[PDB]
Structure 1
Amino acid sequence: MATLLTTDDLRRALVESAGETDGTDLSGDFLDLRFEDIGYDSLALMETAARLESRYGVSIPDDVAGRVDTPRELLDLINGALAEAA
C-alpha cells in the first residue's frame, strides 16, 4: 500500500498552507524551486508535511521537515517513506 501524492497533490496542498489561494504557480516541474525563495517557513513545511502524514500514512519527524529546501525533497519524504515502510 503506497498511494503516492503527485505533483498536483503537493501543489494544491502547498498552496493551501499559504492560507489564501494566491496562486504561487507550482505546476509542471517546480521541484527545482526553493521554499526559501518562495517565502516558505520551515514551520509551514512541517505543517504541509503534517497534512500529508495523516492523509497518506506517513510520519515525518519535526526536524526532518525543516531540512527540506526544495519541494522535491518534501515530496520525496512522503513518496519515499511509503515506498520504504508503509
Structure 2
Amino acid sequence: MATLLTTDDLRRALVECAGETDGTDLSGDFLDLRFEDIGYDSLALMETAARLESRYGVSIPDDVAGRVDTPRELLDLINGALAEAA
C-alpha cells in the first residue's frame, strides 16, 4: 500500500514531454544518461518538473532539480521529499 514514487513513474514523466513514439530500445536499463541524450540540460525538464511538483505535492527543488543530470536522482529527489512529508 505504501507506494509514493516508482521508476516506471519517472519514466512516464520523461515521455510526457516527448509527445508520441512507440520506439525506444531498453534492453537493460534507462537510468544512466536519460537526461544527457536529447538535450535535457534543465530548461527542458524545468517546466515539466514545475507542474509535476504541484500535482505530486512535493516541494519546489530548483537547485538539485535545476541541475539534475542523473535520471535515477530525479526519482529519489521528489520521492525523497514525499518520504519525509509522510
Question: TM-score of the superposition, structure 1-length normalised?
Answer: 0.71
CA distance in 1, matches of 2:14, 2:73: 13
More helix by share: 1
- Tell me, yes or no, if the aligned pair for 1:4 and 1:79 is still in contact at 8 Å: yes
What is the CA–CA distance in structure 2 between the aligned matches of 1:14 and 1:75, rounded to whole Å? 11
> Hey, which bits of structure 1, 4+ residues long, moved more than 3 A?
19-29
Q: Tell me which structure has the larger Cα radius of gyration.
A: 2
Offset, 1:3: 4.7
> Contact between 1:11 and 1:27, CA under 8 Å: does it hold in 2?
no
| Closer/same/farther in 2, CA of residues 58 and 77 from structure 1, 3 Å limit | same
TM-score (norm 2): 0.71
Q: Which runs of 5+ in 1 are unaligned?
A: none
User: Do the aligned partners of residues 23 and 66 (structure 1) sit closer, same or farther apart at CA in structure 2, a change above 3 Å counting?
Assistant: farther
% identity of equivalent residues: 99
Give aligned pairs, total.
86
List alignment gaps of at least 5 residues for structure 2. Answer: none
